[PDB]
Design a binder for this molecule. Structure first.
Ligand SMILES: Nc1ncnc2c1ncn2[C@@H]1O[C@H](CSCC[C@H](N)C(=O)O)[C@@H](O)[C@H]1O
Ligand SMILES: Nc1ncnc2c1ncn2[C@@H]1O[C@H](CSCC[C@H](N)C(=O)O)[C@@H](O)[C@H]1O
Ligand SMILES: [Mg+2]
Ligand SMILES: [Mg+2]
Lengths: 324, 324
């Protein structure tokens, strides 16, 4: 028989083979052994079940593994295979309408998407917190932070300059293809998911928002837009291509899971915001601006980022991006 | 302004940055200096124009660079930038309806797609040959050959076995996810474009068809299906995952451009035909079958491959694939 589930397995394969992500959760859960032992847990978006099994292994008395997509069936098999069917219960469907037999002492969730909020799953976690978490209960991870940095993307620089290198390799001048390539690769309003490294970072990364996930008002902050202003000074001479956005989350003890290009790579990579064309900058060129993360009005699952930026003495500009 | 041309630049970037492909054409054209010097050339599907410029640099008196897609505008700029606007003429639209002022002494074309015939551009080259090529004129490349080999895809083997390795890395048994992963990654009828190496090849590659591009009847062979039977003996014990198909083309002198996994990688990679699940084989396991390349009836641009195969003493089986 033929099945149409390639993407289902591949997304969960990518997450579990992400050792930074999976080991950070494993250890962040283990570090909360004191708060979980003999207690009850809700795993929001349990996927293949691995975080719910981690919670049971951390001492949890009972875990409700709630999963809306078709992969829930695999999670129930994984639970049984690990001998945990008496303590980890896999519940299909959205956490917003699942029926648990009790409120829970803790919620664990791997809810983050590209640019932190793509897929807009955080609202489901907060809904579950309001509906099912006991007063003073535990949320894992407990907080998120958002970061921005100006970038000179080395790979993009090579792709753009490639056309002027053709003469050196084939004896045909194609340097007029550079304006065309720049229009096509940068003159669009899509957020580009790409992994960078420290070689690409043009100034000290700036924290522009800090989200305490249990805080009053956050569900409404998410609808109005999460973000803030930033300011930085360029390290050296380079073409500025735009900005990279990334995040970390923290497990209280604390253990930090980072998606920074200065840190080990993860499947989240970074969310890149390209200007329409490169801007030359030098050492100590001042850059300031504002970043807002928003749901897109067409598809609230889809991340929108509104960028305001000012490079040196240029006028401030605005560019409105939506997830690729 | 925002443009929607990312894929246009990226496909031509991939071809020009493919040094195996581009240098083989450059040299295959140069090798025909005697047949091209002072003569006229039609470049079918000129793209960004580089092959037409190669022809002019090989001595051609006049080159008609015909291109149906929007990139034709870039080719006219490239021609002008190389000072060739008096001898290389860029004509937009399909070669089937272009008007040339003369018949031509030679046709050059980079028409090959994944699995050789995906995109079905060969029929356009043959149409142009019948309509515009002088009697006894030159076609570059002049021939193509098709190859098949049984494969044990090392990357696929790792992805499938990954689920049974989770216990060794996180202390959670996920080995039941293997049946699921196999269904999703192999239990489908799509041709998978993937680059392999010699490590993946399970028996001596077999040539199953040879296409002399100028031969009588080929346009009708393409509609009925191109291919033939094959037989081989496995090198050693391994899971058989299916078959890889690839091609070469030859420039008469001859210079061969190969897409074999035993040869330097190209952007064509190979076209992979996975069985529904792996079949264990051993040294000297006999494998035979037949491969037919066909246009898909829904979208004649889209390659279809009909596979018949017999592994050892198993019954012969059939699997009907269509391009991803
Ligand atoms: N409202 C909701 N209720 C239940 N599951 C949800 C949900 N919103 C998103 N999901 C699911 O949440 C999962 C997030 S991916 C994380 C999977 C798993 N916890 C792991 O860490 O490996 C996906 O499987 C997605 O289908
Ligand atoms: N019938 C047709 N007439 C004109 N161009 C065609 C065509 N069928 C396909 N094409 C074009 O043929 C090109 C094949 S890609 C090869 C591009 C170029 N010769 C190079 O080698 O770099 C594409 O640009 C495609 O748009
Ligand atoms: Mg995610
Ligand atoms: Mg091609």
């Amino acid at each position: 028989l033929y099945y149409e589930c390639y993407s289902d397995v591949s997304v969960h394969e990518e997450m579990i083979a992400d050792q930074v992500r999976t080991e950070a959760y494993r250890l962040g859960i283990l570090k909360n052994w004191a708060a979980l032992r003999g207690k009850t847990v809700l795993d929001v978006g349990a996927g293949t079940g691995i975080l719910s099994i981690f919670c049971a292994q951390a001492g949890a008395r009972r875990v409700y593994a709630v999963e809306a997509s078709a992969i829930w069936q695999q999670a129930r098999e994984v639970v049984r295979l690990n001998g945990l069917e008496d303590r980890v219960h896999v519940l299909p469907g959205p956490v917003e309408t699942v029926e648990l037999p009790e409120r829970v002492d803790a919620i664990v969730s791997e809810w983050m998407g590209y640019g932190l909020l793509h897929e807009s799953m955080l609202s489901s976690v907060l809904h579950a917190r309001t509906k099912w978490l006991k007063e003073g209960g535990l949320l894992l991870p407990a907080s998120a932070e958002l970061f921005v940095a100006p970038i000179s993307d080395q790979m993009l620089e090579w792709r753009l300059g490639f056309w002027s290198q053709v003469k050196q390799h084939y004896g045909v001048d194609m340097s007029c293809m550079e304006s065309f390539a720049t229009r096509c690769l940068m003159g669009h309003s899509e957020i580009v998911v790409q992994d960078l490294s420290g070689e690409d970072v043009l100034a000290r990364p700036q924290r522009f928002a800090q989200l305490e996930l249990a805080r009053a008002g956050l569900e409404q902050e998410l609808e109005a837009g999460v973000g803030g202003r930033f300011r930085c000074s360029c390290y050296g001479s380079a073409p500025l291509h735009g900005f990279a956005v990334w995040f970390q989350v923290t497990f209280p003890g604390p253990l930090v899971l980072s998606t920074s290009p200065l840190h080990p790579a993860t499947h989240w990579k970074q969310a890149l915001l390209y200007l329409n064309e490169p801007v030359p900058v030098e050492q100590d060129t001042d850059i300031s601006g504002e970043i807002t993360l928003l749901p897109s009005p067409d598809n609230p699952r889809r991340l929108r980022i509104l960028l305001r930026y000012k490079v040196g003495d240029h006028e401030e500009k605005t560019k409105d991006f939506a997830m690729e």
